[PDB]
Amino acid sequence: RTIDPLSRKEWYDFRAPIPFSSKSFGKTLVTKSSGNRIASEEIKGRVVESTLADLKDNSNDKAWRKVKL
RNA sequence: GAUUAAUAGGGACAGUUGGGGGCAUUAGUAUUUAAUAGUCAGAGGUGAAAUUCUUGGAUUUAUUAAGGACUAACUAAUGCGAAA
Ligand SMILES: [Mg+2]
Ligand SMILES: [Mg+2]
Ligand SMILES: [Mg+2]
């Protein structure tokens, strides 16, 4: 290996809104700020496709409901 | 002084029924393309292959947008229309 391609990558934990569990569900990858590119702002519009893996108690039976965040 | 009133036909009317028609509306993924992000070396296609596309970054992934079509699944020895 020479220079792992993810060298510049920062990770972020997803947080779910009021109906769902406050606990993070997944994590996302983004490139570091370049002085033009602002790290936080490259993520303004991203879209998360999840089950209810997102409601701790009630989740396990509903794999049938997809939620976009 | 006007025959009945055809399980003849025309008309009226009443609750329906239909994927019948004409206008408007309106959705839905899909193909194709574009944009914005990603990532990389292969994608396609075939019996094998080769023409093609690919580092100017394809195929692939996410989110939108444009544009013409088309109405899946439910869908059937079911329906409507004179037939198409
Ligand atoms: Mg469209
Ligand atoms: Mg359309
Ligand atoms: Mg029917």
CA of A21 to C1' of B47 (A): 55
- Technique of determination: X-ray
In order of A11, A13, A28, the CA distances from A4 in angstroms are 15, 22, 18
Distance A49 CA to ligand 3 centre (A): 38
Residue A28 has a CB neighbour count (10 Å cut-off) of 13
Which tokens is A27 given?
């994590």
Nucleotide nearest to A30 (CA to C1'): B38
Closest-CA residue to A28 (of A16, A46, A45, A41): A46
Residue nearest to nucleotide B62 (CA to C1'): A47
The two beta strands, A9-13 and A67-68, are: unpaired
| Sequential DSSP letters for chain A | --S-TTTTEEEEE----TTS-SS---EEEEEPP-SSS-GGGGGTT---EE-S-SSTTTGGG--S--EE-
Site of tokens 């779910």: A16
* Resolution rounded to one decimal, in angstroms: 3.7
The two beta strands, A67-68 and A49-50, are: antiparallel
